[PDB]
Design a protein around this ligand. Structure first.
Ligand SMILES: *Cc1c(COP(=O)(O)O)cnc(C)c1O
Ligand SMILES: *Cc1c(COP(=O)(O)O)cnc(C)c1O
Lengths: 361, 361
């Protein structure tokens, strides 16, 4: 019954209220004598949940029109392949903004499908300085422009997105979707593994401009065509029904929290406390990206040595913290502070950080 | 009680004991102060569950060696493409045993990838008579022989599998995996969406002979290569962690029910009760498949007219039954009686069949 101070990066914290709600009806959903997990995906009870989740997500975004919410299995990683498979034609280039680890994974899959183009890159800065929007330049034969809204491993995040005109803009928002208002109409496609900022694992949310996916390439595996999901409302085959049920519950909670403006305000407050702890640390803590590139979802920082960082992690685990060790490719520390991470976890972290600084520095 | 008499064909019943166990630790798993849904897929707690599920599955099968249990998203429908993508090379032919609706789906997908051959077919019997194993004719260039162990829509099920020599045998066991002992060594690969007989929707279990997937075709998207899953223990990206946790719980329950021999005996007793009710009804109820093809997982039967079937299903719903109308492509009725469907549901069904009959025909 004490809750861990959970800073896991993915899967990650869920709202305690959502866990309590789901637990209470886990065996018997609405006196039907079945769990939601045991019901037909083509029955009216599940279909209501499946359709409600889509409607609530669009409503959180201000009810843009012309977009379909799809639920696809396979994680954001499968979208790295499915996007160029569906949109990259011979003679075109899949254009990427290269901001760090997840942009790199995305470009990797596109290179297997066709020609690609790096439209902008922060590699020269070791991904610490995001490209300004002015630096993004598309090749003329661009099929699309793909960016990563929040680079979960490096701790960098775009505050705004480019206008790409008639080229579809595609965003991997896995680690920041529904953390903040954005205008969906800038995008032809946004996607997110649900387990980062929504919390359930096994479902990827893909929100796509219907006009972009009316006819998918006919040589593709059925399950890798977007029109399979559009034409069948993500029910062509059995969906991840418990995951979608849990997404529905999380969307209700976001609405209760004041929608995207409310969670944004709450997350800015959380992030501000922790960045202030780094920025007022006497050099004991240092951030891992430039101030103007800082993420409000994944705060990355370093100590003077790897040995100190190991010590910090170990001590933090003894005090109830989970997940603060940075991803292994980059080291350091990473405090993931997705919507459902409570401010009290962040206050505890800053207190811990003050103690460790005082005793080890 | 209050449990519905759940004959849904997929997603389908879970054991009540599994649902209660999962519910009880849904908010706080083993005093970690997190739900299993909030933990890292690379943390030792989840990794233990992930690895335990594989070990328990293999132990239920008698601990065959040289096989890897993989957890892949996308359902059995994604395996319809992933199998030929990985094993169908130029100059080879993917051979299919064509037994009905799900074999047909599998073959259709393979044709998108490469050359195919129908090695046997029960089309002339409208898939009501399984092909005898001696009817299977491969050509020398066969990449594999794929069969469907249980044809979920038609109600037909193989009791025994062919020896295919050096050609790998692949089985879609979505609707009967772990309902019965079988010798895994006959197979190169077996797969199943978990949602019929292993747990909830959103994980596909793929059990593959390691030597068949040592080197997957390197032109494939990373997520569509089996060696991605083998090399990374199905943790290359975020797995369907709650679904795998639930599969682990179901595997525990199968062992507690006496393992595969125990669930086989239970399911034969369920199936025998319902086949007897059909057979003994003086034609009021009529089994669809020929007797030697009868499935113990999905029992398909007809009344005199579809309107009458509709009446039967509607009458069954006020008695707590769900799921009995047959798939729309074949009509009739279908009692899906996977491992977790209790005998008590089947007894209730047979009593209902008698009461329905009595007022009518
Ligand atoms: C975690 C993550 C991914 C990978 O998601 P999976 O569901 O594990 O495939 C993709 N992009 C970003 C930005 C991520 O944080
Ligand atoms: C349900 C079923 C499938 C399809 O499974 P999905 O997970 O929905 O893709 C495939 N094969 C058989 C035998 C089935 O019963």
């Amino acid at each position: 019954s004490e809750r861990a101070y959970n800073f896991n990066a993915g899967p990650a914290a869920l709202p305690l209220e959502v866990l309590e709600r789901a637990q209470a009806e886990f065996v018997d959903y609405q006196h039907t004598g079945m769990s939601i997990m045991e019901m037909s995906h083509r029955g009216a009870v599940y279909e209501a949940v499946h359709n409600e989740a889509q409607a609530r997500l669009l409503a959180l975004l201000g009810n843009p029109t012309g977009y379909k919410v799809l639920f696809i299995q396979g994680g954001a990683s499968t979208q790295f392949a499915m996007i160029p498979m569906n949109f990259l034609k011979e003679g075109q280039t899949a254009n990427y903004v290269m901001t760090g680890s997840w942009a790199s994974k995305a470009l990797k899959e596109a290179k297997l499908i066709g020609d690609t183009h790096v439209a902008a890159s922060s590699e020269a800065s070791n991904y610490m300085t995001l490209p300004k929007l002015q630096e993004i330049q598309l090749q003329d034969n661009a099929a699309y422009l793909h960016l990563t809204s929040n680079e979960t491993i490096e701790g960098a995040q775009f505050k705004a997105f480019p206008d790409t005109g008639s080229v579809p803009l595609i965003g991997d928002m896995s680690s920041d979707i529904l953390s903040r208002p954005f205008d969906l109409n800038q995008f032809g496609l946004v996607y997110a593994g649900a387990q980062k900022n929504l919390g359930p694992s096994g479902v990827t949310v893909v929100i796509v401009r219907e006009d972009l996916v009316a006819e998918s390439p006919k040589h593709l595996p059925t399950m890798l065509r977007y029109d399979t999901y559009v034409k069948n409302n993500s029910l062509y085959n059995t969906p991840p029904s418990f995951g979608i049920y849990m997404v529905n519950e999380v969307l209700k909670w976001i609405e209760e929290r004041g929608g995207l403006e409310g969670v944004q305000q709450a997350n800015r407050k959380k992030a501000s406390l922790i960045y202030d702890a780094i920025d007022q640390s006497g050099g004991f803590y240092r951030g891992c990206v430039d101030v103007d590139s800082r993420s409000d979802m994944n705060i990355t920082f370093r100590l003077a040595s790897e040995e100190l960082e190991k010590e910090f992690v170990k001590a933090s685990e003894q005090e109830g913290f989970v997940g603060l060790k940075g991803h292994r490719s980059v080291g350091g520390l990473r405090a993931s502070i997705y919507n459902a991470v409570p401010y009290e976890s962040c206050e505890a972290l800053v207190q811990f950080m003050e103690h460790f600084k005082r005793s080890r520095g």
